[PDB]
Structures are given as structure tokens and as C-alpha cells.
Amino acid sequence: KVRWPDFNQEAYVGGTMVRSGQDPYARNKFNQVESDKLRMDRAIPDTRHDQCQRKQWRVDLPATSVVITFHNEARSALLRTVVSVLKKSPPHLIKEIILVDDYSNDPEDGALLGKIEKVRVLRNDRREGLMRSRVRGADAAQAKVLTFLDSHCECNEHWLEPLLERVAEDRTRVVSPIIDVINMDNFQYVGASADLKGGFDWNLVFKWDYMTPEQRRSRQGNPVAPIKTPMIAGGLFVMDKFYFEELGKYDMMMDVWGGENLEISFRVWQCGGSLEIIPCSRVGHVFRKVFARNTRRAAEVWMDEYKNFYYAAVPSARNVPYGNIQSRLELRKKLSCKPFKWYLENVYPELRVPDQDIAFGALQQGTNCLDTLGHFADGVVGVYECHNAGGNQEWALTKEKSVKHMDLCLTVVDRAPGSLIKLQGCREDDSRQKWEQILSVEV
Amino acid sequence: KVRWPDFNQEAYVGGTMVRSGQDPYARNKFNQVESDKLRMDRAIPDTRHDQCQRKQWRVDLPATSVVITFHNEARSALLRTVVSVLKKSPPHLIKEIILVDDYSNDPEDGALLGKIEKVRVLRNDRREGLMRSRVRGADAAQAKVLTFLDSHCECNEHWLEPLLERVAEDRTRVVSPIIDVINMDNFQYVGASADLKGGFDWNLVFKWDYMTPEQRRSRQGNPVAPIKTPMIAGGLFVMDKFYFEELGKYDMMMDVWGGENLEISFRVWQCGGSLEIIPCSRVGHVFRKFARNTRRAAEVWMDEYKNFYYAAVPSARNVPYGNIQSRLELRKKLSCKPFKWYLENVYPELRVPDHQDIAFGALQQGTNCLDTLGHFADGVVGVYECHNAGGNQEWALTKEKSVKHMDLCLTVVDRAPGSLIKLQGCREDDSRQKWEQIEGNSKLRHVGSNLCLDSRTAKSGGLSVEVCGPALSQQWKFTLNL
Ligand SMILES: O=c1ccn([C@@H]2O[C@H](COP(=O)(O)OP(=O)(O)O)[C@@H](O)[C@H]2O)c(=O)[nH]1
Ligand SMILES: O=c1ccn([C@@H]2O[C@H](COP(=O)(O)OP(=O)(O)O)[C@@H](O)[C@H]2O)c(=O)[nH]1
Ligand SMILES: [Mn+2]
Ligand SMILES: [Mn+2]
């Protein structure tokens, strides 16, 4: 067993370096020459709010089993992940670090990290992917609380105490750090915004957005308070171990190319827990950039009818075979989880839910986009380039066949081609406001 | 006195029509030829939401005194305003209509309408303006509730009872209809949005804006409920007569040029009343196309925040505005709340610069604005056409010299020319985040460098840092400058 500072990084990253000519993004989708240049404990900026830095963190907290899962991870990045945990965490709070080597090409990527204090390595036989690899890691953990990280993260100062404080207080909380960004081309560590919450559109791809100005204003008194989130990124969180178990771990027939965020985020909220982002906890993550099977498996279990709006948004998924899900279904009733309606209403109210529009989003043409120009009733309407967007470029075509923004409708004021169209109050039976898929007017 | 239906509109109107060749816009800045063709009680669409078409008010509502003030109004428009009040309002709720002719060139405009049932006319002596004219009318009013309208309005079906119900239930409510649009060219009557709230930017110019999504969401249960509003348009409103008096009427030193929304809206909210837009009340208004009145409002009500207005309108700082003691004494007497309380509780969606911000608002290059492009940390930044809806075009230049949006800051990741700037978490100690306005706030340069913000690759990669130079791609001005 070696203490982390005495581990031989030069040797370990030694023979795996990018060879002249070869493509540094090739193995990984990030720049390995840049990764390999970094020391395993390289200094990173303290990105935490000023208030965190003056906090006295409790350390009379339950220890954690840190589970890190990986498949042909760059050696420099894997080691850097492990050492950030060991350097930045109170040693009595790290029971162990469990590395699940999920079929890497050189088992030595993992096994060599086995000489480090607290690290134990489990190797999969075939490639099982992230979700089952985590379940296995979790099954082997000896501590009361689980911490899951990706194999290309860098923990910041006092990242762990604020997370464990939460779950030690109430074991139904599944909590996450603010995920700082490590740039995939130059490996600079970048402070993220603390004003974000996790969410998604009806295609179900995870996305961030800012809290509303009202939510921010409500936090002014304690701006480092926990943030409740509809969904976690999924790569990094901490969860009470028995809670992870009792709620059903992860779905064992998910495969990769999987969204580790989706199903667990719905289950936790519907089945009585909460998801939080904890501002004082900062961990960096290298961000970069068939899939449908896993998403299907989540939707079919958790969303009830609103699953329809997903298939609406992504018809391309309607017949990807997704397999047997009965044991996941049994699980939901066994737990007496609330319905998806409740989650939309209570957890993600700000998600736009459809219903009977013929069409939504922007009216393109094809560089530009229909735009109110900020005009109201009796104003002309126009185009700007598409910004992607929302606001004055968002429109609906209604069951009633109107083209509307808020309650204003494009109105044929004068049939004479091609005089100007106008915004006017939407009128269910006004015929000057009816449009069909087949500014000013013309033939 | 004459039944409104018995009034001869052709005699009244016909005596002032536009003649051969003469500009039909000259007199009023609207098309008088189109106005004059209309019947005095012309049919207008019912723009009210279907859910109005019950609906909800007591049986013993209080009568109102309607006050309409005018200077050289087009006779046809004036007459339609009066007949629409008479035609659309239950007769027992109209105690009287008081016309204040604020020194119109021809006194017959008003005096001939004095033959109509319930109308009485007062002529100003001299040109007093709308505010002083309104106080004169209100002082004459015999009923318990005041209704103010402009002289180019057309009331719609059951416009009055929902206004009267609000104030009969709580006399500290000052209430307005949804104001429908009467087009100044063709005089067509156009239904307005019901999703608006009144407001203003730091230049103190009134504007509408859509409610927030959460506000809309909280109205699912009753989409025609009252709408609380930080500011009223000011032309049209109903107010308990005694409450109008007790609260200080209007500031009697306001002149012609105002501006009638501002001072009263701040005073009502700060002194414990409220302002509402009532969706089931619909009235049309002919819309068409100075700092003394605004200063008198800012100096009395705004406390330190008046400084943002002066920032926005630096020329206002010179302008005489007269004596405000009486108003400050009114403010103390009524125990009004500070402007800070108003911004927090009444209008939290106005975004307010930090006390030590150096500049604020949009950062404009011609008609384009610095836009985050929906990006977050480690993302590039760019420009779009300035849309004045804020959001991704909202910025501040802070005490710490950063250009910031939410808690992200423009960061110079590489000093090499043509290097892209990036959004990173603001950190006070980060020298890469420090920027300064130069050359009369026409450009932004990275502190301690020869590098300036540049748009040349806006659309093919992002904004960059580039050697400072005459290029127009390096011009940037904040809309607000402290
Ligand atoms: O246990 C694992 C962990 C990761 N990966 C692979 O490594 C890459 C990164 O996935 P991960 O979720 O670790 O990182 P992300 O890029 O999703 O943040 C993908 O090709 C995964 O399939 C894997 O096969 N098994
Ligand atoms: O009592 C009045 C009413 C109106 N006006 C003038 O009439 C014009 C339009 O004002 P109003 O408020 O009637 O209409 P709006 O501002 O809505 O167009 C302006 O020149 C005002 O000075 C006036 O001098 N005294
Ligand atoms: Mn990752
Ligand atoms: Mn008017």
C-alpha cells in the first residue's frame, strides 16, 4: 500500500502516452497530451462561494465508500480522480475507494491503482457498462453512505462534508455537488454557475437552466443553501447506502448507451426522496460529447401517459426494442410511488407540458425566425435570426388553427395582398386568424 | 336635456370636418376622416374572455362620477367616448359625466355636449393640463367613486361593474380595465393581450410586459382574476373618491407635458393601496405618438433610486421642477414605505443595479447586443439583435471590474489576438476577468492589456479579444451608465 503522494505517476502514465503523430483525442474524446502533462494533484482554483470558505465543516459524519467505474479511461485522468478524493477529503470519512474496471484493455490501468492506500479494484469480465458496474461497486461497499464519481473528475476543497451532512441528517436526500467544468481541449478547470438546476425537454436529454429570478431572490439570505433539483446530471452524487438498496439500486437491464440521470431522478422524487445540488460542494468534470433503449426503459416505468409526449418528440424511438421491465414495475407499486403527474406538478412545474397543438417551437424560414419584435396588440410582426431561444420566437399552432404567441394571434387584417399582418387578441371563432400548413400576406 | 340617442351627431360633428386636400392627421395625430365616418354608438367586438360572460359582482354597486378631460379633442372621438359610457353602463351607476374642457380653442366642443343627459361641463379658464383638470373634475364630483377616462375611449360590454366591484369590496384598490387598441389610421377596434402587467425601465418610460411563467401558472384557477400591477397606464382607472382625496389627489404642480401614470402609481403602492388590471373590464383607447413631471415624482418617491433614473436620463439632472415640500409632507403624513420596499414587494421583476455597479443593462454594438447564446461556464459568447426583453442580453460592469451575467463573467482565457473569450464563474481575484470602458465608453478593454472585446468572429466561433483598433467590431456601449 502506498500513500498517494508517493505513488509513481511518471511510471504509471509512463508507457501509455500519445505517440508522435497520433491523435490525442483518439482514445478518449478529450486531449490526452494535455491531461498527461498535469500532475496527479495539480492545484485547482477554489470556485466555492465566499461563504463556504468560512464554514467550519462538521467531520462527525458517516464515512463513505467512493465508487468509480471506468472503461479505457486515460490513465492520467483516472489517477487524478482518485488522488483528488484522497487529497481533498478527511481520511476518516473515506472508508475506501472502489474502482470498477469495466473491461479495460490493460487491466493494469486499474490494478496498478490497487497499490494506493484505500483503493480496491474490481474487474468485470465483459463490458457491463456504467449502471451495472455501479451496482456491483455498491454491493461491495462497506460504508453506510455511497459516493459515485466518473473517472475524470477533480474534487475541490471541502467537497465531501457538505454532501455527507445532508444525507446524515435525512437519508432520503440524494445530493450532488456543483459540477465545475474541466475543458476537454486544454484541461483548464472552470468554475460553474451556482444558479443552475437540472431539467430536460420531452426528448428527455438532460439540460441545465438558470433558476428563475424569483427563486434566486428567495435565496438572497443564504445563497449557499441546498438547491432542490428535478434531475441530477447523474455522474456525481452521494446517497445513503441502504436507501440506494431499498429504492432499487439501478435498473439492472440498462446497458449503455445510457442516461444514468433519467430513471433514478424520477424514482427518487416519485417514491418519496429528494434530489439536491449543494453549492458549497464543488467537483470538476471533464465534459465532452441505440441510446433509446435505456430511455425507453425509464419512460415506460415512470411517466404514465406523459411517456406519449416523449414519443411525440422522438417518434424515432417508438419501436426500438427495450426488453422486460416487469420487475421495475413491481418495484414501483411495492414502494407506492406517486404518479408522474405529481412530479410535473410538484417537482418540475416549469416544464412546459403539451396536451392539442398542431405544432410548437419556432417558425423558421430557415435562417431567420418569426418574431413579435416585442410588439403587442395591433403591432406588426417580423423576423430575426433564430437564437434557439424561446421568448418572442416561440409560437403555437392551435387545435383551432391559430398561430399564437401568449394570447396574441397573427391576424389577416386586410385580405388585399400583400398588406401587413397584425397581432391581435386570440379569438376562438375569428376567421381572419385561421392558418393551415399547406410580415405581410400575398398569394 | 337630451337622450343620447336623440342627440344629433351630424350637427355636432359636421361643424368641424376635414376639408378637401387638408391633412386628416394634422389636428389630432389620428385620422379624423376615419373617426368622423363612425356612428356615435358604433358596434364594437366583444373582446372579453368567455369566462367574463357570467359574471361576478354585487347587486348594490356604488354609482360613479365619470371625469373626462380634453384639449382640442376631435369631436367625433369625444362624442363616442361619452355615448359609450352612457350606452354600455347601467344608467343607475352613472351619476354624472363631468367634461373638463382644458381651454380648447372652441368652447362649443364641450358646451354642445352639455345638452346630453348626465353631462356637465366645466371649462378651464386657461390651459391647466390633464392632472390639474382631473382634480377640478374630481372636486366637483358628487358620487362616491371616481372614474377617469381619456377623451378618445370606447367602453365595451359590462366594462364598469367589474371595476366598481373591486373598489366596493376594498376602497384602497385603484383599478383599471384592460385597454383595447383603437387604430389611429383606420379606427378599427382591436382586442389587447390579457397577459400584460404595467412597468417601466430606469428611464421611467412606461411599458407593458408579459407576466412571468409562474404568474401565468398561478392563474390557471381563474384566468380572469384581477391582475396586480406595479404601474397603471394612467389614462383609465377607477378610484374611491375619498381615497383619491386622502391620498393627495394629484400633485398640483405637475404641468401639461406628463406623464400621469408615474407619481400616482408609486404613491398608491407605497402608501398602502394597490393597483389592479381587471380583465373582464375592456375599454378601447385610440393610441397615437418634458422631464419636470418625472423629476417631481422621482424626487419625492424614489429615495436613492432616483439616481438610476438620472443615470439613464443625464439631461434630467438640469431641469427645474419647482417646490415639492407639500408632497414630502404628504408622504410623511401618510407614513409611506420606502422605494426599496416597492421594488421588493411590488415590482421585483425590475432588475436593479447593485449600488456600486459601474454600468448596467445591455451592451450594445449598433443594433446588436452581447448575448450569452444560452451558454454557461466554459461557453463562448456572441451577439444577437437587441430584443429589450433582458434575459441573455442582461449584463453589469461591477465594482470589481467584471462583465457579468448571473454569476458568470467574461474571461480572457488567452491573451493571444483572436483568442475567444469565455464565460467562467466570477472570482474577484481573477485578473483575467477585469475589463474597463475607454474612449468615452465606446469600447471595452481588458485591464492591463492592449486587447479589446471584438465581434469579428461572433458568428463563426464567438466574441474574441483582438488588438485594440479603430474597427467597428470593437464598439460596445452599456445602455446604462453610472
Ligand atoms: O463503467 C463504465 C464507465 C464508463 N464507460 C464508458 O466510458 C465512456 C464515458 O462514460 P461516463 O458516463 O463514465 O462519462 P460521461 O462522458 O458520461 O461523463 C463511455 O464510452 C462509457 O460507456 C463504460 O463503458 N463503463
Ligand atoms: O386635460 C387635458 C387633456 C389632454 N391634454 C392634451 O391632449 C393631448 C393628448 O393627451 P391625452 O392624455 O388626452 O391622450 P394620450 O396621452 O393618451 O394620447 C396632449 O397634448 C395633452 O396635453 C391637455 O392639455 N389637457
Ligand atoms: Mn463524465
Ligand atoms: Mn389617450
UniProtKB/Swiss-Prot annotation, chain A:
Residues 61-166 are annotated as: Catalytic subdomain A. Substrate binds at T69, D102, R127, S151, W257, R288. GO terms for biological process: O-glycan processing; positive regulation of immunoglobulin production; protein maturation; protein O-linked glycosylation; protein O-linked glycosylation via serine; protein O-linked glycosylation via threonine. Disulfide bonds join C52-C280, C271-C337, C369-C386, C409-C426. One of its GO terms (cellular component) is Golgi apparatus. Changing R136P: In CDG2T; loss of ApoC-III glycosylation. Pathway: Protein modification; protein glycosylation. It is found in: Golgi apparatus, Golgi stack membrane; Secreted. Residues 226-288 are annotated as: Catalytic subdomain B. The keyword Transmembrane helix applies. Keywords: Congenital disorder of glycosylation, Disease variant, Disulfide bond, Glycoprotein, Glycosyltransferase, Golgi apparatus, Lectin, Manganese, Membrane, Metal-binding, Phosphoprotein, Proteoglycan, Secreted, Signal-anchor, Transferase, Transmembrane, Transmembrane helix. Changing M406V: Found in a patient with multiple abnormalities including neonatal hypotonia, psychomotor delay, feeding difficulty and dysmorphic features; likely benign; does not affect ApoC-III glycosylation. Its main location: Golgi. It is a single-pass type II membrane protein. There are two conserved domains in the glycosyltransferase region: the N-terminal domain (domain A, also called GT1 motif), which is probably involved in manganese coordination and substrate binding and the C-terminal domain (domain B, also called Gal/GalNAc-T motif), which is probably involved in catalytic reaction and UDP-Gal binding. It is linked to Congenital disorder of glycosylation 2T: A form of congenital disorder of glycosylation, a genetically heterogeneous group of multisystem disorders caused by a defect in glycoprotein biosynthesis and characterized by under-glycosylated serum glycoproteins. Congenital disorders of glycosylation result in a wide variety of clinical features, such as defects in the nervous system development, psychomotor retardation, dysmorphic features, hypotonia, coagulation disorders, and immunodeficiency. This is Polypeptide N-acetylgalactosaminyltransferase 2. It comes from Homo sapiens. The lineage of its organism: Eukaryota, Metazoa, Chordata, Craniata, Vertebrata. The gene is GALNT2. The chain holds residues 75 to 554 of 571 of the full protein.
